[PDB]
């Protein structure tokens, strides 16, 4: 089972649903990161970089994909194959996004 | 205000996210819906070939748009402009399925 965030399109993408195995990977229940921008994954060594083309391509909505060094709620580190896309309705207005973690 | 549906991939596609526009345009609360098949937004009037093509889609996770007829929580039918896609990983193997209603 891959993991899985949707977030609202606008006002910093505060997330408002993961899936089983989101819990199961980083270890946060949902109550926990319901709300809240999906930055909180990252740590002191993630790649500045990286982290630049993931919030220029979410500000342009074009989807996106980045392997990326994320942290554990107990901070234990992890590698995350992360692809982000945009959810459109048939105005081409961003209702969402969805952020996947395939492993593999 | 475009209404959002997410459901599992598998077994019959239980909802498992709906977001504020869902429960404002059908009048559903989330508890309401959350483990269930989305058919039950359907109702006598609901053209039974429609049903068939998204049936079709979902089954083989190919993106497809129809308009069909809904019904609210209180029984009152409204136009559905539906949009569902499969959400991939990055192997192709399909994680969930999104439905937008366009207004
Ligand atoms: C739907 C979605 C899922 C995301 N999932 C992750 C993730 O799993 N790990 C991660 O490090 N960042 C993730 N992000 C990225 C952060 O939310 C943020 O966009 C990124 O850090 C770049 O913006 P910033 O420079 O403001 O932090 C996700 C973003 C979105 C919209
Ligand atoms: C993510 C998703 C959202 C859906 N949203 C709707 C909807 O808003 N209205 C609707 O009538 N059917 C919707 N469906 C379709 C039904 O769940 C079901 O697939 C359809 O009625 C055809 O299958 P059946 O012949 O087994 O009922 C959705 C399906 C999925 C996967
Ligand atoms: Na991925």
């Given at each position: 089972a891959s993991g899985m965030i949707v977030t609202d399109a606008g006002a910093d993408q505060p997330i408002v649903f993961v899936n089983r195995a989101f819990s199961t990977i980083t270890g946060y229940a949902p109550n926990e990161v319901l709300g809240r921008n999906a930055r909180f994954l990252?740590?002191?060594?993630t790649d500045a970089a990286t982290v630049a083309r993931l919030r220029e391509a979410i500000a342009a909505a074009r989807?996106?994909?980045e392997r990326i060094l994320n942290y554990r709620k107990d901070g234990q580190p992890f590698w995350?194959?992360?692809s982000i896309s945009p959810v459109?309705?048939?105005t081409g207005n961003v209702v969402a996004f969805v952020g996947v973690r395939t492993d593999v």
């Open positions: 990252q740590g002191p060594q989807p996106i994909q995350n194959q992360l459109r309705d048939e």
